[PDB]
Amino acid sequence: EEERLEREHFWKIINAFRYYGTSMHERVNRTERQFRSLPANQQKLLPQFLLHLDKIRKCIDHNQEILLTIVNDCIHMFENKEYGIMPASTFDMDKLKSTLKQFVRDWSETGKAERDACYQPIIKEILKNFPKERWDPSKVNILVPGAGLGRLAWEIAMLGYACQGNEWSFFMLFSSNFVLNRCSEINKYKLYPWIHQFSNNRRSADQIRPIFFPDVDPHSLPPGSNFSMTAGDFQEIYSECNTWDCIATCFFIDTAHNVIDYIDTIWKILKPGGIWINLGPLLYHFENLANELSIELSYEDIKNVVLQYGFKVEVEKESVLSTYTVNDLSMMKYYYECVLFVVRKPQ
Amino acid sequence: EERLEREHFWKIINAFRYYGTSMHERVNRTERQFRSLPANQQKLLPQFLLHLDKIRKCIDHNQEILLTIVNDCIIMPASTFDMDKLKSTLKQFVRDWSETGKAERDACYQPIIKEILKNFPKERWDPSKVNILVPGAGLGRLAWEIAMLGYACQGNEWSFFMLFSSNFVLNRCSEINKYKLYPWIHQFSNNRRSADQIRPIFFPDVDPHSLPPGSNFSMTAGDFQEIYSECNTWDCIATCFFIDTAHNVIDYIDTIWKILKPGGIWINLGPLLYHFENLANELSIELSYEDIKNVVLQYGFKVEVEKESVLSTYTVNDLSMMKYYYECVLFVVRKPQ
Ligand SMILES: Nc1ncnc2c1ncn2[C@@H]1O[C@H](CSCC[C@H](N)C(=O)O)[C@@H](O)[C@H]1O
Numbered sequence: 001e002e003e004r005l006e007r008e009h010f011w012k013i014i015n016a017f018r019y020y021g022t023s024m025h026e027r028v029n030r031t032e033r034q035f036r037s038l039p040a041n042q043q044k045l046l047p048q049f050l051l052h053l054d055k056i057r058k059c060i061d062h063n064q065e066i067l068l069t070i071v072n073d074c075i076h077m078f079e080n081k082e083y084g085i086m087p088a089s090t091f092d093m094d095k096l097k098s099t100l101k102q103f104v105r106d107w108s109e110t111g112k113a114e115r116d117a118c119y120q121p122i123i124k125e126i127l128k129n130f131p132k133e134r135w136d137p138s139k140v141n142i143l144v145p146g147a148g149l150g151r152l153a154w155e156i157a158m159l160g161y162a163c164q165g166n167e168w169s170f171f172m173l174f175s176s177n178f179v180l181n182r183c184s185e186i187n188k189y190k191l192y193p194w195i196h197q198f199s200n201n202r203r204s205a206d207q208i209r210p211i212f213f214p215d216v217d218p219h220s221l222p223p224g225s226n227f228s229m230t231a232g233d234f235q236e237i238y239s240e241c242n243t244w245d246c247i248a249t250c251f252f253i254d255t256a257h258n259v260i261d262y263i264d265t266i267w268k269i270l271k272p273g274g275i276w277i278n279l280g281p282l283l284y285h286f287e288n289l290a291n292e293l294s295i296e297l298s299y300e301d302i303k304n305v306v307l308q309y310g311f312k313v314e315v316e317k318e319s320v321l322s323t324y325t326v327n328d329l330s331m332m333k334y335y336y337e338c339v340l341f342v343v344r345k346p347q
Numbered sequence: 348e349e350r351l352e353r354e355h356f357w358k359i360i361n362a363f364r365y366y367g368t369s370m371h372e373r374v375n376r377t378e379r380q381f382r383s384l385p386a387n388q389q390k391l392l393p394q395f396l397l398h399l400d401k402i403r404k405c406i407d408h409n410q411e412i413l414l415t416i417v418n419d420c421i422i423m424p425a426s427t428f429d430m431d432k433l434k435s436t437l438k439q440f441v442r443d444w445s446e447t448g449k450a451e452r453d454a455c456y457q458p459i460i461k462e463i464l465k466n467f468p469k470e471r472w473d474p475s476k477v478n479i480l481v482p483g484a485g486l487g488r489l490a491w492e493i494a495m496l497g498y499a500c501q502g503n504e505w506s507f508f509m510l511f512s513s514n515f516v517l518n519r520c521s522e523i524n525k526y527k528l529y530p531w532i533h534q535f536s537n538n539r540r541s542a543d544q545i546r547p548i549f550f551p552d553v554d555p556h557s558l559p560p561g562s563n564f565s566m567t568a569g570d571f572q573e574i575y576s577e578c579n580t581w582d583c584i585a586t587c588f589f590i591d592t593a594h595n596v597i598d599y600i601d602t603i604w605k606i607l608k609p610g611g612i613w614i615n616l617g618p619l620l621y622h623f624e625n626l627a628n629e630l631s632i633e634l635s636y637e638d639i640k641n642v643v644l645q646y647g648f649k650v651e652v653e654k655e656s657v658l659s660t661y662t663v664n665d666l667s668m669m670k671y672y673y674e675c676v677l678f679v680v681r682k683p684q
Pocket residue numbers: 105145146147148149152166167168169172232233234235250251252255256
């Protein structure tokens with residue numbers, strides 16, 4: 001039951017990767033169809049339009065190649081031997097499009113500013129509580145749930161902490177497995193994360209511009225590094241109590257069906273005296289989804305729940321600005337005024 | 348014609364009437380889910396169901412303000428599309444007619460109004476003989492501000508959501524801040540404090556019936572392409588967050604060029620969030636700003652002002668942990684004489 005539904009989920013994501021080209025091409029063919037239905041005099045006002053559509057198509061083909069490399073990597077895994085054709089949902093295609101942007105955030109020089117706003121404060125808090133002068137960082141155990149493409153877990157590991165990223169989503173697992181285990185040359189790969197955006201373009205070239213990755217070799221972890229990634233629901237995988245020195249969550253807790261469940265887990269699996277570092281907003285992932293449990297709390301209520309569990313609050317900064325896979329050439333942008341806090345389980 | 352507009356009219360009246368139902372069902376889902384939690388978890392939040400009740404009261408109040416707009420004008424399940432438009436409408440009240448919306452208005456309307464004063468000064472024009480057209484006037488605040496300067500200004504709006512509201516605010520309203528809405532109660536995510544959700548706004552911040560004497564202000568209902576067909580008529584057309592509503596922006600540009608007088612100016616400020624992009628079966632020509640400028644040039648407009656990266660927001664919740672902004676373009680182009 002567990003293993004079969006995992007198996008179903010698995011090939012569904014695979015199929016979604018395989019379907020990216022068909023989806024996007026149909027979108028561009030809608031556009032070409034409509035453009036050609038215009039009065040011809042209007043089409044001659046834009047004598048480069050059809051050419052630009054052809055450049056998008058090449059971009060789609062290139063993105064599809066990256067996605068097929070990821071699919072090829074995960075099918076032939078040493079530990080994916082346990083798992084063994086339909087059109088993907090529009091929901092999967094959106095997750096796909098989100099995945100490609102995630103490569104900018106986590107593994108491109110283009111996403112350094114965003115990492116500076118979201119990751120530096122977490123890393124800064126870790127160094128504050130486990131200073132190199134008093135702690136062998138190899139003996140400090142740090143769990144990073146919802147690690148995504150894994151850049152933050154990786155950065156912690158670069159300092160020598162015994163860091164383990166966990167992730168539930170096969171979009172994220174397929175991709176991080178590829179970037180972390182196969183990209184051993186800086187900026188060897190390239191993708192087009194903005195071709196999906198047709199609104200709010202200053203220049204048409206803006207939509208077809210590339211980003212390169214990885215800006216950094218993942219295998220430049222120094223010897224003595226202790227870095228790993230796990231696949232599964234972190235509530236089910238990390239059930240052993242009193243284990244972790246530090247749990248670090250970035251844009252994570254608003255992905256729960258019930259964030260109270262998350263807080264209950266973090267309390268049980270922290271070592272007495274350990275800390276929970278959090279940075280992020282409260283965009284509840286299940287808010288709209290029919291037939292899904294979604295408990296949407298204000299930050300005020302989250303703090304009250306944290307306080308009642310017994311945590312003691314060491315750092316609290318509200319209005320920490322950051323973006324999330326922003327396109328800095330776009331005429332429309334979203335930003336977050338995140339909360340950062342460091343709470344501590346009493347010893 | 349008459350029969351199909353008849354259908355559109357009552358569909359929107361019905362959406363106005365279904366607002367309380369739609370919102371209460373949303374709250375119902377929350378309450379069922381909270382009550383489904385284990386008792387130990389529920390105890391941790393002893394004001395949650397009380398807070399829900401306060402939301403419901405805000406809901407009920409909003410529904411009263413909506414019914415007032417509909418009787419001042421004069422029950423089936425409306426589409427989520429309508430209800431989103433409805434929620435959008437209540438947010439517009441903040442933008443166009445609340446002290447809270449002043450920051451946005453200064454960002455979006457003041458640069459347009461300054462350009463109007465620049466191109467129609469008293470040393471050259473009798474302001475009351477200058478005809479200015481505001482397509483997509485919304486709740487009409489901008490058009491009103493232009494008419495307040497002594498120009499002959501006509502707002503135009505297609506949506507019945509706006510027309511009901513703009514009528515109610517411009518004709519049936521006198522006393523400042525007499526009325527209040529709860530425009531944020533539908534946002535359950537990204538709240539700092541629970542109390543921000545049930546936070547009230549008041550309108551109108553300024554008295555609409557303070558037009559000076561001889562002022563020439565009017566508002567019309569319908570497709571601005573179909574209503575305005577007299578070529579060489581308008582001294583100025585002012586579009587604010589408007590042109591990206593077109594099925595085909597080239598069509599809007601053609602209408603504007605043709606209905607401006609020789610010497611008339613088109614002022615534009617907004618982004619390019621194309622309204623029909625992600626809608627099935629609807630035509631949608633999504634152009635870059637570069638392409639729109641190439642089209643405008645080929646028509647023969649002379650370009651007088653072009654500012655990119657004009658920062659502004661649109662019905663923003665100042666207290667929310669999530670926020671959008673636009674890097675708009677402002678331009679003024681003249682139809683040559
Ligand atoms: N139950 C669960 N256990 C582990 N990860 C989960 C989870 N539910 C959702 N997630 C994942 O949590 C991730 C949050 S995205 C955040 C990624 C990264 N740390 C960053 O901030 O940039 C998503 O990739 C999502 O798939």
